[PDB]
Amino acid sequence: EKLKIGVVGTFAIGCLFPLLSDFKRSYPHIDLHISTHNNRVDPAAEGLDYTIRYGGGAWHDTDAQYLCSALMSPLCSPTLASQIQTPADILKFPLLRSYRRDEWALWMQTVGEAPPSPTHNVMVFDSSVTMLEAAQAGMGVAIAPVRMFTHLLSSERIVQPFLTQIDLGSYWITRLQSRPETPAMREFSRWLTGVL
Amino acid sequence: QEKLKIGVVGTFAIGCLFPLLSDFKRSYPHIDLHISTHNNRVDPAAEGLDYTIRYGGGAWHDTDAQYLCSALMSPLCSPTLASQIQTPADILKFPLLRSYRRDEWALWMQTVGEAPPSPTHNVMVFDSSVTMLEAAQAGMGVAIAPVRMFTHLLSSERIVQPFLTQIDLGSYWITRLQSRPETPAMREFSRWLTGVL
Known part of the structure; x- marks a missing residue:
């Protein structure tokens, strides 16, 4: 099970990375491919499933779920x-x-x-x-x-x-509209929104 | 009074340029230096940069690249x-x-x-x-x-x-679009930097 996620580097370092050993033990069947970006990201060109990014939640063709402040x-x-x-x-x-x-x-x-x-x-x-x-x-x-x-x-x-x-924006996990969802995606989403 | 806009790959900014910046400011008080950082993917024309400090092999499209360091x-x-x-x-x-x-x-x-x-x-x-x-x-x-x-x-x-x-998988370069004029403030900076390095 392959989940590919692009993560704004601040979030990767300050929030996510400390939590990835929890997502290890709790879902050892998902192969997480993590890349970082500087909040300028083309998820389509990068082949990302999810994108974790900073802003207001309104990206063209994009469904955004709030994560944290x-x-x-x-x-x-x-x-x-x-x-x-x-x-x-x-x-x-x-x-x-x-x-x-x-x-x-x-x-x-x-x-x-x-x-x-x-x-x-x-x-x-x-x-x-x-x-x-x-x-x-x-x-x-x-x-x-x-x-x-x-x-x-x-x-x-x-x-x-x-x-x-x-408060000039928040952290969002986002998916392109045309991007098929999957079970590994839901399980990560659920797990991450959960802990926060 | 003379304005100079430079985009710098972050690694170089932190590990090399910023510790030397006070020296440039002292020595060239007449240059107004505007620094931005990038993650080595950068569009100098869109950001209006005079110079770009970046990592690579020295050959970008229509670009004049000068070697800085290993x-x-x-x-x-x-x-x-x-x-x-x-x-x-x-x-x-x-x-x-x-x-x-x-x-x-x-x-x-x-x-x-x-x-x-x-x-x-x-x-x-x-x-x-x-x-x-x-x-x-x-x-x-x-x-x-x-x-x-x-x-x-x-x-x-x-x-x-x-x-x-x-x-060695690349070095650091200071680059200028061929279509971008070189001004007096640019000459002084790249001469100061290549020197200190």
């Missing part, structure tokens, strides 16, 4: 965190963002500050995993889904300076 | 799996982590004089060596990746290189 907050190194006492202090440093719209402007507005200047030093990332590597090394303040990075928080490599969160 | 690849794994690996064949006690590119474990095993891995061997595919190496730190399997790009993980002992044997 992806609430974002500033994350930074302990070195930078020690110089950050209020949200405006974040603007002492470069901002790290994704290719998606509005992340820093929405977060700043949400906690009652003005958006950053349009010419603030920013670096754009295709993957939150790379973003948080940059942040660990002090390249700037990241904004990403806190729940995918608890291994850095608990190990103290990253700090979350503020409680406020924003 | 990217010799060797198995990398957590300290825990390393403790169970004394010979290359021990690697196959564990799942293999690979990229979308062809033949990395086939070539490396050939090179150390071992048989190819089973075609049914447990393998996970990664779009990024950064993501690959996160997975290896967590013991998902054994990575193979450009060793010189993970000096931070090696020296901090989060990752181990059990064997010195290393293979």
Whole structure:
């Protein structure tokens, strides 16, 4: 039984991979082919059964099932965190963002500050995993889904300076419309939505 | 005042470029550098990039590619799996982590004089060596990746290189579309970078 799943790398690392030994013992008859992507994925061209991705749940020709929330907050190194006492202090440093719209402007507005200047030093990332590597090394303040990075928080490599969160999308497991479903697919789906 | 947009494959960004970035900013305060990362599949024309830093053989369609540095690849794994690996064949006690590119474990095993891995061997595919190496730190399997790009993980002992044997399946290049003008800010950057490397 062959199940091929493309997984946004953040989710693979922060959520799924720790859980795959559970899906091993509980369904030892399914041969899981896992590939990662940077949330830009052509499931048809890649021959994926399922796709795990980040966003709002509205993809053309695609049936999406919600998996879990992806609430974002500033994350930074302990070195930078020690110089950050209020949200405006974040603007002492470069901002790290994704290719998606509005992340820093929405977060700043949400906690009652003005958006950053349009010419603030920013670096754009295709993957939150790379973003948080940059942040660990002090390249700037990241904004990403806190729940995918608890291994850095608990190990103290990253700090979350503020409680406020924003919600610019969630994690979805999705299937192309024209894509036949299967029993291994249902069993994974069921198992994963289950644990979350 | 002079603007420069560069897209960088993530591995290179983390393992090489970003640690040097402060030096470029100091030295060339008059250049406004806009950095983005990619996972080595990138459309420079669509993203409006001046330069693309990427991994490969140096020959992309209608592209001028300058050599940056070598990217010799060797198995990398957590300290825990390393403790169970004394010979290359021990690697196959564990799942293999690979990229979308062809033949990395086939070539490396050939090179150390071992048989190819089973075609049914447990393998996970990664779009990024950064993501690959996160997975290896967590013991998902054994990575193979450009060793010189993970000096931070090696020296901090989060990752181990059990064997010195290393293979060339491409290098890092800084590339420019032939149709893209080269500006003064571009010349200064690629000269600064090829220099520091």
